[PDB]
């Protein structure tokens, strides 16, 4: 009989929904005075207060440390970081922006535009490190190595087709696998170096990148769970099967890449365990149980501390 | 005979191009150490150093000023700003993100993710103003008015179909029309109030929004001109015809809306001239000549100063 508060919201659509429906409906503005899910406001406040730029970190203080490393190890660092910059590039320009039309709330739509911009800043910060420490030849040979190393490329090629959003839940899982899983095999190396007193200022940038990417992974898992809980029991079963199948395939690709990257340095076995440990955390973030054994996820305490 | 510097760039594609080509090619990371167009670096540096959040502005200092306004004028401000928040919402979630795959350079792809995030901040800042000054009833009735006012909706509905990117140059023009043209009929009102000593702290937020949106318009015009200059003379003619046809149609829609919004307050005639003045600047930003007369673009010096 009586009008409810904010009835206009039920008689309108967001602009992206207007487009998805084929251009029908009355469009509403975002309402930041009525937040439908308090978690959206909490995350908005945290990610915007955490804004940073790499020019504030004195990476040049690392030059003495960098010059004590052999050319082989300088090459390893440049290659590893350039491979991470590729993942950043995919997230910023494809994966995170593809989540905007997958949103449950108006406020979530713009939180993912923050995510995409901040992982662009992460890619910029790797550039800033190279500008300070590397020679032009080191930089160019790392970019050549990235495009020509098939084990590296295959990890990226496995995930990009899901961002076409044929299925919004599969897209969201494929997006979260970047900051929630593929990050960690590369971050093993700065954690290893930091524990041995090398490149302390570079490590500060690594920790700022980590602070952002952890929230990106958490928020995607939160929205995944809220949507999956509304599906039928058999659709929930199909989604759980897809997640495990995709993750197992990606672990195989990641193991092959980390072996190629690290084997000559003796770091491959430890980095793979570090990666699989974080695959277990990734599943828990989606509301699933981890199947991995204690032995295959063992981490050195000094790496756990750096984390 | 000899390899050129950065040959890898010519043998690879960005991730969005890999997707556009149907999943073929070797993917390259962004290279922030080799910037192909120096203008991209300049704009990246400016927009990131200009980061701001509305919580830093003491809008509560405007309460005394706000309480001297009649309820009719408080309603006008709330309606006008909520209509601007709708435009912000379209830019953040549809228009600016649609420019990422239209880019000429890798660096441009992530500059547009910054644009989308910052116009989300603009929408947030209008919310922040309402939280401080408005009653809950004022806020709700403005959202109801936005969805139910056809002259307001028609301006948005005219532009959204171009963001599907059937034509990247038409998409880019439709994107730039938001910060480059539709902004100004709404910004007439805070400029009018500020010139009369009302709401000085709100005006500071307006000027921060303006500082961002001006760069958004400029950068889109720069990339429009660089691409159009590579087309055949007859394709350049077709594009110029489209721009003028679309702008003239949008001016008609904007005039109808500003008359409905402002006529009872006596502000409509001045606001329309202010709008058409900026339509002339919009054409110049795309490399075209303005056809508008001095009489139809006349601005009060006090408004020109506020600008």
Numbering used by the authors:
A (entry chain A), B (entry chain A): 1 to 307
Quote the authors verbatim.
Aerobic RNR (class I) depends on the ferritin-like R2 subunit to generate a catalytic radical in an oxygen dependent reaction; the radical must be transferred back-and-forth with the catalytic R1 subunit, which performs the ribonucleotide reduction. Radical translocation between the subunits proceeds via reversible long-range proton-coupled electron transfer (PCET) in a transient R1-R2 complex. In a recently discovered active metal-free R2 subclass, denoted R2e, this tyrosine residue is post-translationally meta-hydroxylated to a 3,4-dihydroxyphenylalanine (DOPA) which serves as the radical-harboring residue. From an experimental point of view, R2e from Mesoplasma florum (MfR2) represents an attractive model to study active radical states in RNRs.
